Structure 1
Amino acid sequence: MGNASSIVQTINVTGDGNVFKPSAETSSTAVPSLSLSPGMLN
């Protein structure tokens, strides 16, 4: 997961100042499931 940029880079993956701080409040979520029952969708 290396990186290299030319002239300039708005983000540096291997640079300094980044933060890795897992927390219960932040968690991590996506869209796993939705409510699509036939009767309720109509």
Structure 2
Amino acid sequence: TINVTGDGNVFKPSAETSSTAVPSLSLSPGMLN
């Protein structure tokens, strides 16, 4: 479906498309109840 070794793919890292998935999040007890 996608050819990794084929042509046509795009590799332009940019400052606006900074990579980051889900570092962490608020789970503290008091504000969670």
TM-score, with normalisation over the residues of structure 1?
Answer: 0.73
Q: Where does structure 2 lack aligned partners over 5 or more consecutive residues?
A: none
Q: CA RMSD in A?
A: 0.6
Larger Rg: 1
Asked which structure has the greater RCO (Cα within 8 Å, sep 6+), the reply is: 1
The 4+ residue runs of structure 1 with deviation greater than 4 A are: none
Q: Where does structure 1 lack aligned partners over 5 or more consecutive residues?
A: 1-9
Q: What is the total number of aligned residue pairs between the two structures? A: 33
Is the helix fraction higher in 1 or 2? 1
1:30 shift after superposition? 1.1
Partner deviation per Cα, 1:1-41 (whole Å, 9 max, x = no partner): xxxxxxxxx11000000000000000101111110110111
